[PDB]
Amino acid sequence: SVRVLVDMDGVLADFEAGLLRGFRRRFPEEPHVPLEQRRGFLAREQYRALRPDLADKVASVYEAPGFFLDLEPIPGALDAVREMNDLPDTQVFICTSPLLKYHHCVGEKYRWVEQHLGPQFVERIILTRDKTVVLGDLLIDDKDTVRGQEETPSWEHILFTCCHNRHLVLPPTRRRLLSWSDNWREILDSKR
Amino acid sequence: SVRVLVDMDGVLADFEAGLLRGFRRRFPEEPHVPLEQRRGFLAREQYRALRPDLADKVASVYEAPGFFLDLEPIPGALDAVREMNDLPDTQVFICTSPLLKYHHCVGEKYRWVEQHLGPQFVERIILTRDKTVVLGDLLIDDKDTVRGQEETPSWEHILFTCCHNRHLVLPPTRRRLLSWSDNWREILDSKR
Ligand SMILES: [Mg+2]
Ligand SMILES: [Mg+2]
Ligand code: NA
């Protein structure tokens, strides 16, 4: 059996697109960061660098009620996770971190899964700020480094390509998924 | 470092006492199950056995807004988890399962931890319906058996005594903690 931990923001749910659209809607006069100029995992810090007052503004978008509930799916993501879940000798968990400002994030993530993937996938959510203490064979995640209390996680991190990580070049000893069309089944097969 | 997974309901937060209190307040005419007569992990099924329509009435208590937020702490629990978190070479996570009816459970659990233990402990929450895929040395949990996709969890389950499990007689292979005034430090030491 192969256990796949599938990240939520940037892999199933399009956080970055949601952030930019909410920022453009609520702060139309201010400078913004086009998606393909994004660099680094923390959008708030790139906005701060653009202009100091933008840090709190962009935070207000992703901390607002409804923000997580209303995110659009990543193309191909929901079909892929459905397909993956239905493979023999495969199990899937959705392994996601809440924001530090958790209040409108935790419940909305559960509802987003319920609505987009259904009740069977709600039961496969793991909410944690430390993914390294979750046992699995693979972690598909857009964060460029996934760190925590286990120095040597059980899983292999598969970087899922996203605007903020596109610029990185992995060494030949590592693998990137370019998108959900980039033959994920072969990565799972390497663990069988 | 020894990593201790600490359950929430029945170990930190007194679910059973809150359930009974809420049931007696909402349904003051109805028969109830005194805590000392509780048997089996799921109160709802004991109520169903008492009279079939009581099952849904008890569920309406623990599904109501505020139910989780308003639980009282288990005696000694908050002090013990504070002391444990500060021990040298010791890691604590709060590892808790949401209800299937998650809506008024997930956010309320985060707020309960924030209020009773503080923001830093909120970062130590792991929400999962499968605790067997969480890495640790020890799981302190009142559920009589803790099962999931790993047939042999990394952790040793320490059964935390609660009204519903007290009469359970276990083989000497399974260890029990009678309360937070029992010798939990020795159990941690047995893994160092
Ligand atoms: Mg992500
Ligand atoms: Mg419990
Ligand atoms: Na399957």
UniProtKB/Swiss-Prot annotation, chains A, B:
One of its GO terms (biological process) is allantoin metabolic process. InterPro entries: 5'(3')-deoxyribonucleotidase, HAD-like_sf, HAD_sf. Its cofactor is Mg(2+). The active site is at D7, D9. Its EC number is 3.1.3.-. It is found in: Cytoplasm. Substrate binds at F15, F41, Y62, T96, K131. Dephosphorylates the 5' and 2'(3')-phosphates of deoxyribonucleotides, with a preference for dUMP and dTMP, intermediate activity towards dGMP, and low activity towards dCMP and dAMP. This is 5'(3')-deoxyribonucleotidase, cytosolic type. It comes from Homo sapiens (Human).
